[PDB]
Symmetry: C4
Subunit: 388 residues, 4 copies
Amino acid sequence: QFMQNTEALCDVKGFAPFSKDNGIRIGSRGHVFVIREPFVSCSPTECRTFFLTQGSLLNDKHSNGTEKDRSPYRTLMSVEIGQSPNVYQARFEAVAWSATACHDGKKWMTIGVTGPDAKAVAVVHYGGIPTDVINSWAGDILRTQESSCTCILGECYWVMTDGPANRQAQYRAFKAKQGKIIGQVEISFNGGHIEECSCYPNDGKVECVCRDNWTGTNRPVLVISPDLSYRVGYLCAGLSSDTPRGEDSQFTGSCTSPVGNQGYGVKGFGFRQGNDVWMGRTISRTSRSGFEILKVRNGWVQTSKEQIKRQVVVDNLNRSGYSGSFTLPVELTKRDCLVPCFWVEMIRGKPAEKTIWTSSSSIVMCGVDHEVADWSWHDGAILPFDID
Amino acid sequence: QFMQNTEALCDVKGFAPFSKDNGIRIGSRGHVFVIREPFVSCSPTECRTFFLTQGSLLNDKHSNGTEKDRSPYRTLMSVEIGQSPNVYQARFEAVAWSATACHDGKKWMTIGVTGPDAKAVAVVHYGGIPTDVINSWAGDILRTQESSCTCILGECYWVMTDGPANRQAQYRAFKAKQGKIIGQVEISFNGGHIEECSCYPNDGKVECVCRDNWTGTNRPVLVISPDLSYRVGYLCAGLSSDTPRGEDSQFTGSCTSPVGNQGYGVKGFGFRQGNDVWMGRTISRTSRSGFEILKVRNGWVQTSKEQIKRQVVVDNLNRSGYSGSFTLPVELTKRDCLVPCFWVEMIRGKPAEKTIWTSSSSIVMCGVDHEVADWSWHDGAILPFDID
Amino acid sequence: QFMQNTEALCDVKGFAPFSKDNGIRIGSRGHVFVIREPFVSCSPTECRTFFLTQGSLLNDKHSNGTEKDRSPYRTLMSVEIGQSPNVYQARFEAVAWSATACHDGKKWMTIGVTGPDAKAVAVVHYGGIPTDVINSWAGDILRTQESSCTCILGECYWVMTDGPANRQAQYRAFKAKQGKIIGQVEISFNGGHIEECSCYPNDGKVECVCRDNWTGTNRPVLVISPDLSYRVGYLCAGLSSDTPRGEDSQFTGSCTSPVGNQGYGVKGFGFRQGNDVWMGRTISRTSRSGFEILKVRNGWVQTSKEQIKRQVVVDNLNRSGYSGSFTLPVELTKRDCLVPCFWVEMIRGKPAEKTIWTSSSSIVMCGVDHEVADWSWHDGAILPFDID
Amino acid sequence: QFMQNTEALCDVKGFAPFSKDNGIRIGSRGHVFVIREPFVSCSPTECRTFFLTQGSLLNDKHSNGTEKDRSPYRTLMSVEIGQSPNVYQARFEAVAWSATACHDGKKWMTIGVTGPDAKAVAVVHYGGIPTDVINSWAGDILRTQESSCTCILGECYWVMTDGPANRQAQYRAFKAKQGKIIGQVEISFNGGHIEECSCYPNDGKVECVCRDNWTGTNRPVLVISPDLSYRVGYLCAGLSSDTPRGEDSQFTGSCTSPVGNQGYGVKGFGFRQGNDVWMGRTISRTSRSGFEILKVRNGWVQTSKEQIKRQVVVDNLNRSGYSGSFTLPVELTKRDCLVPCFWVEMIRGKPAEKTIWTSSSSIVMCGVDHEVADWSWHDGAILPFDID
Ligand SMILES: [Ca+2]
Ligand SMILES: [Ca+2]
Ligand SMILES: [Ca+2]
Ligand SMILES: [Ca+2]
Ligand code: NI
Ligand code: NI
Ligand code: NI
Ligand code: NI
C-alpha cells in the first residue's frame, strides 16, 4: 500500500543518535567506496543510506581526486543505514552525479542526473528500472536535492535547478506517480537562489529548506501543495544557518529576501515545529566545521532570535559538511505524527587535509521527546592513509 | 505466473543510462572477477548482469591470460544490474565458456556450454539445477548467444551454432519449457553465417540480430515464431553495423545476402521499430572503439540510408566491445509494450593494452520517449595495474 | 505474534557446543571488526551475535587501542550466530558503548548507550529505528547488560546502572512494549553492587545473575516480575563465581550479602534449575583464564557446596572473558520449556599479550539432556599480528 | 511440507556438469576458507555446498597445516552450490571435525561431531539451533559420513562409526525427526569396515556405498529401511572402486566379503540402477588422481565386469579426492524420479605439493538422459602461493 504521509510532523525536544557508519575508518583496510553526498531515506520496512561513488575505493589509486566532479563514472548506490558504503553490501541505484531518492510505500523511486553540463539527462527509476526522463531545460547543469525526496499519497515530489551556481538560475518542482512524471511547476523566485533542497512531509505538504548560493546567508523555504501550487520565501528566523555567514549579532532576518550579501553556501536543513523551527548549521561561520541544531521560538513565521534549545552533534574542532532531512514513516514508528530526522556528512581529505582523496562519513539523528546532551560523533579517521 | 511477453516492442526516441558497474576501477583494490561476455536479462522483479569468469580475480596472478578461452575453469555467474562482478555478491549459474540466460516469469533458465571442442555439452539449468542437455551435433565448438534468451508464454527460445567460425556452419533454434527442451529447428542459411545472436520479444515472436563472421559486414536477422517456423535474412538497412566494416559511402544494403566481403565481426544488436530500426555499432570501422546507436527510417524492410536519430554512448577515443539486447517486462514497467534496452561491453587489457590480463565493464541503456544527449560512459580504469 | 516466553526453563544435564566464530583467526587476513562484549540473542527464526565495534578492523592501524573505551565511534552491530564479526555480513544496530538486545516475537529491540559520561543517552531501537530514550539519571556512566534482554508476552525487560564502578551505585529495571518505555523501578540494594546483568526468562519472570564490582566475589541475583515488583539478593551457593575471588575452601555463601571483600569482577551468568543452579566461572581465581560450568545441588536456595556436575569449556591455559545467558525460544525448539544457552568471550591482545590491539571471539553452548565431555574450544589465533 | 523422497532413483545414461567453484584459484587473492570434506545437499529451493573450515584463510599464516585434523577451531559452514567457500557468503552450521547435513522439506538438519577423541559429542542441529546429541559409544573417534544424509517422509537417516580406523570398529545408523533422535540400530558387520558412507534415497530406502579402511578394496553397501531393519554387504561388481586397489585384471568381486587385502581407502560413491550400478573411482589405483565413473551391467547384484559406460570427469594428470552422492528433489526437477548427482573433491597442497597448506575445490555432476563427453574440470590453481 502507498504511504499516506499526510500527518503532521512531530514536535520534538531533542535529537537522539540513530546511526554512525565509520566508513572512512573502516576503509583504511576494508573495501569502501570513496563517496560524496550521503543522504538517508526510509521505506515502510527500513532506512537506507544513499551515496554517490566514482567506482573507486579508499586507499586505491583511483581515489586520486583528479577527476571531474560530474564524471561518467559517478553512480548512485545504497546500503542499510549505519553500514559503511562498502562494495559488498552495496545496491546499485542509478548513474548519477546528482541525485534524490524516496519510497512511496510500494517501491523506491530514484532520480539520477548524468550526462554533459549543457544537456544533462535526469533518469527516473522506479522499482529498480528506468521509467522516465527529464532533460535539461536551461542548458546549465541540471541538478537536484542530494537528499530524500518526499512522497505523499503515492505521489513523489522533488525540486531541481538548471542554471548558474552563483547568480539567478531557474527552479522547478516535479511530481511523479509510479516513476512517471505527471506534473511540474516553475518556481518564480527573482533575486533568490535555490540549490540542494532538504525536504520533508508536514500536514500533507512538502516543506523544503534549501541553499542560496548567490547572495543569501539565510536559507530559502519552499512549500509545495499536492496540486503544485507553492509558497516560496526565506526562513524567517533572525539567525542565519548557511555557511559562510556573518555573526549572529550583525544579522536581521527576512521572510522574503536574501540577507548577508555573501556567496557560496552549504546544503542544510530546517524543520517547522508549529510556528517554531529547528535549524541546523555548522558551528564555524566560515568553514564546514562543527554542527549544531537550534530551536527558535516562532522562527518559521517571525524574524525571531529567541533560541530555546541548542544541541551540539559535532564539535567545532572536527569537520562537518552537508546535512539533510528525512522522516520516519508511521508504518515503522506507529506514531500519530511523522518523526523528523537528519544526517550530517563529515568530509575528510583534500584540499583541507593533505591527501590525494576526499570522502565523507555520516552521523544520523532522530527527533525524540527528551532533551539530549551535547557531544561529538565526529568521523574519527586518522589521515593520511597509505595511498597518500 | 509466466510472463506473456506477447506485446509489441515500444517505439522509442532515445536511450537513457540505466547502469554502469565500474568493475575494473573497483577491482584495482576490491575482489572482482576477470570477466568476458557480460549480458543483462530481467525477471518480473529485477534485472541481472550475467558474466563469464575464469575463477580468477583482477590484480591476481591467475588473471594471467595464458589460458584457453574455452577452459574448464570458465563459469557463468550473475549479480544485480550495476553491481561489479565481485566475488561476494556473485550468484553461481553454470559451468560455461558460452552461455545464455532468461527468466520465464517463474524461474531463471540458464544454458552453459562446456566440454571439449569436438564434443561440447550444453547444460540447461532451470531454477538453479540442471534439467536437460544438448550435445554438439556437428563436432565443432557448440556455442550460443552470450546475451539474454527470450521467453514468450512460458516457453524459452535461443539460437546455437555448431561448425566453423570463418566459413559455413550450422545453426539451430531451440525451444524449452521449464528447463525441458521440447522443440528445435535447423536454420537453413546457405552462404550466410550466424553467431552470437541478440534476441528480444516483439509481437509474440523472437527477433534476432546476429553476427556474420564469414563474409558479411551487415548483420543476419532471424525471426522465430512459437511453432519454430522462421524467417532468416540480413538486416536490410543501407548502413552496416558489424566491425570490421567498410565506409558507409561504399555500402549498399541487402535484405537477403551478406555484403562487404570481410571476415570477423563483433556481437551487436538491432531493434525493429515498426518498419524502422535502431542499430548499434562501434564508431570505428576497424576496431572495437566507440559506440553509437542509429535509427534508420524503414531500415528493417528497405535498404534505407535515411538516418533520423543518432546517439553516442561511448566516444571514439575509448574502447567498446560486444553489445546485446534485452527487454524490460511489463510486470516492472506497467507499460502496454516491451521496453528495449541494450548493454555495451567495454574491453580493457591485452593485447591492445600492455597488461597480462583482459576484462570488461559495462554500460546499460534503456529506451525512453525523449531524445538524450551524446556522452561517453567509458570504462575509466587506469592501466596498467599492480600485477602488471 | 509475540513470543510468550512464559514457560519454565529446561532442566539440563550438560551443554553442547552451538557455535564458534573464529573471528580473530579469520581477521588475520579477512576484514573483521575489532570487537568487545559479543552476546547472543534469538528471534523465532534465528540466533544472532551482537557486538561492539570501534569502526576499526583487525590488522589495521585504527585497531590501535589508544582510544577511550566509551568513544564516539563505538557502535552495536550483529551477524548470524557463528559468523565472524566481519564488515560485509554485519547489520548495524545502534550507536553504543554499552548495549543490550532482544526479540519480542515480532521485531528486534536494541538499546544503545552513548554520549558523555556525565549525561549519557540510551537510545531504544525497535524494528531498526529509534523509538525512545533514557537519559542518565545519576550523571555517572549510564550503562546496561552487554547481553540479551528478556521479552515476556510482548514486553521487554532490562537492567541499567548509573553511578560508581567501585562503590555504591544506583540500579533500575525497565519495561518496554514495541520500543516504548512503559515502566521502570528503582532497585533497592544497599551495600550491594549490580553491573552487567545476565538475564533469562523462567516461569514468567526475568531472572538475572549479575556482577558486583564493589566488595562481592559472589554474584547478585535479581528476579523481576512483570508488574516490576522484584526480589534482589546474592546467589546463595557456597561457591563463588566472580573473578577475582578467593579459594573455594575459604568461602561461605550468603543469600543476602556480598562475601569475599574483593573489588573488580567479570560479567558472568547462572541458571536456576528448580532449587539447583548452573553457574559459570573462570577456572583461574585471579585472571580471566579458562571457563567451567558447575551444577550445585540446592545452590539457588541454600549455601550449598554440593557440586553434582562440572564441565570444562575452555582450558585454564587459554584466555576467557565475559560470559552471558540467553534462551532458545519454543518456536525454534518445539519444546515445552525454554532451553538455556550461554556464550563465552575469549579475549586476546593487550595488555596481557604484546599487541597494540584487543579483540575477542566466542564459543556458544546450549543445554542438552546428556552429559558432555570436557574440552577446550579456545580462540586459536597466533599473536602477534602483522600490524604489531 | 516434508519431502517424500519415496520415488525410485532415475536411470541415467551420463552425468552433466552442475557446478565448479574455483575456490583455490579465487583464494589466491580473495578471502576463502581453507577447507576439507566439501559435500553437497539440496532443499526444495536450492542445493548448498557444505565444508569443514579451520577458521583460517588461504594465503594467511593460520593456513599453516601444523594443527590437529580434529581441532577445536574446526567448524561446518555452507554456501550456495558453485560459490567458493568464502568468508562473506558463508553460513555457519555447526562446530565439527566430522559432519553430515540434509533437508527434510521444512528445515536443514546438520550433525557436527566435535570434542575429544575418547569422548566426542555429535550435536544435531535443526533449523539452525542445537536440538539433540549423541556421545561416543565406543570411545574412539565418533565420526560420520562427510556427505549428505538422507530424508524420507520427514525422517532423516545417517550412519556413524566409533572405533579403530584400521581394524574392526562399530557402526550405527540413526533416525531423527525434526532434529530429535527417535531410533538407532547397531550394524552387524564382522570382518567388514564402514567409514564415510555416501547415501541417497531409492524406492523409499536409504542406499549407502561406503569406505572400508581395513582390508577391502571393494566398497561396503548398506541398505536401510525406515523401520531400521537393514541389509549390509559389499558392492557385488567385479571391478573395485576404492583407492588404493589392485588391477582390475587381478580382481574378482564379492557380494559378501572384503576383497584385495589392502588397507586405507578414500570416500567414494555408487548409484544403483535397477540391477546395474554407476560407480565412481580415481583413475589412479595408488593415488587420489583422476576421476572416472563407470556403469556396470548387473553390477549391483552380480560380480559383473561388463562395463557399458565410462565417463572421465578429471584427467589422470590432476588431483582428485573424496567423492559423494546426493539427489535432486522432485520439488525442483518436477520429475517422477530422484535424479542422482555426485561431487568430486580436488585436493591441493601438502604433502603431495610443496606448500604449508592443504585445501580443496569441487566439481559437481548430475545425471541426465544423454551420454556426455569425457573432459577434465580439474582444480586449476597454480601453486605455490604467496604464503609459501
Ligand atoms: Ca549562501
Ligand atoms: Ca562480419
Ligand atoms: Ca566482584
Ligand atoms: Ca580400503
Ligand atoms: Ni533490516
Ligand atoms: Ni533489487
Ligand atoms: Ni539462517
Ligand atoms: Ni538461489
